[PDB]
């Protein structure tokens, strides 16, 4: 935020709309500057989030942060399979497995 205040930008219109919704939720305390309320949300780990399709904010503050996520060994390239006809078993003459 401090970067923004020095960079010559104030609070956004949409950040106010979300703050309106947030005080109805009891997330921020009514009667504080937008910076005071946004920091109150940021200490609950929530931020204002804009939908890239619309540009409008998400109607509420959303939890955002850095998480450690792994790519596991089960990958579709290994698992996708289909057969029209194919190999058969000796005695039963049914398709193989």
């Amino acid at each position: 935020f401090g970067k923004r205040k020095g960079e010559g930008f104030g609070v956004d219109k949409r950040e106010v709309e979300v703050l309106r919704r947030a005080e109805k939720l009891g997330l921020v305390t009514p009667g504080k500057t937008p910076e005071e309320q946004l920091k109150e949300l940021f200490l609950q780990g929530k931020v204002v989030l804009y939908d890239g399709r619309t540009g409008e904010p998400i109607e509420g503050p959303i939890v955002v942060g850095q998480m450690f996520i792994m790519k596991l060994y089960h990958m579709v390239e290994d698992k996708m399979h289909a057969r029209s006809t194919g190999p058969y078993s000796l005695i039963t003459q049914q398709p193989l497995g």
Partner: protein
């Protein structure tokens, strides 16, 4: 009463960054203009990227070069960050050459200079070479749009060429602020500020003009019904 055409302010800093203001605008038009331009700016703006690499004595991507610290996978990963600006608008493809030896850390400057092409980030590290380490390569750089993955284009200058992932889009980041403003008669008007960051092959202002032009050209399609 109907609002009149707003003042358009421009605060560009270098070739990397710009701030673009439009004021005053009718309520709710801050995002009506701001959002579609951001979408077009992040996707459809033409640019440049490395599409192929031929390294001497290298048959494929998983090789490793004697004397070089970095593996070929990392080398191509570094060439994917190379930003190459075409001064001549008619030029769609080039080929940069690099020859280095000895105890040197090869950076992007060491590419042999070619006319109408400027390397916007000459400090980028490429390979660390050690006493006796050698390196001769040919990098093909192209102009294109969007993101075209290596499996898609399959560009090979010769038999042993390695196709590379292409991020064509010159736009690195786009944000836009919508702040309150008034014409002193009316309130809850919108002041729109578009922040545009680029890699330098094209300029924040140039992007914004191309984005608007795409959007304009798109609205034309509504002419002929059925």
């Amino acid at each position: 009463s109907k609002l009149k055409a707003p003042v358009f302010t421009v605060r560009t800093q270098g070739r990397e960054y710009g701030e673009f203001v439009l004021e005053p605008l009718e309520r709710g038009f801050g995002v009506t203009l701001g959002n579609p331009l951001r979408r077009i700016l992040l996707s459809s703006i033409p640019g440049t990227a490395v599409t192929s690499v031929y390294i001497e004595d290298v048959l494929h991507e998983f090789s490793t070069i004697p004397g070089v610290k970095e593996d070929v996978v990392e080398i191509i990963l570094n060439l994917k960050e190379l930003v190459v600006r075409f001064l001549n608008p008619s030029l769609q493809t080039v080929t940069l050459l690099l020859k280095a030896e000895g105890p040197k850390e090869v950076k992007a400057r060491d590419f042999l200079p070619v006319a109408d092409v400027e390397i916007m980030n000459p400090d980028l590290h490429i390979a660390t070479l050690e006493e006796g380490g050698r390196l001769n390569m040919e990098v093909r750089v192209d102009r294109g749009v969007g993101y075209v993955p290596a499996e898609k284009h399959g560009i090979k200058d010769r038999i042993n060429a390695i196709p590379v992932d292409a991020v064509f889009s010159p736009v690195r980041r786009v944000a836009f602020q919508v702040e309150d403003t008034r014409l002193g008669q009316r309130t809850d008007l919108d002041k729109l500020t578009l922040r545009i960051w680029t890699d330098g092959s094209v300029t924040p202002l140039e992007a914004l003009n191309q984005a608007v032009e795409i959007l304009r050209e798109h609205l034309t399609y509504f002419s002929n019904p059925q």
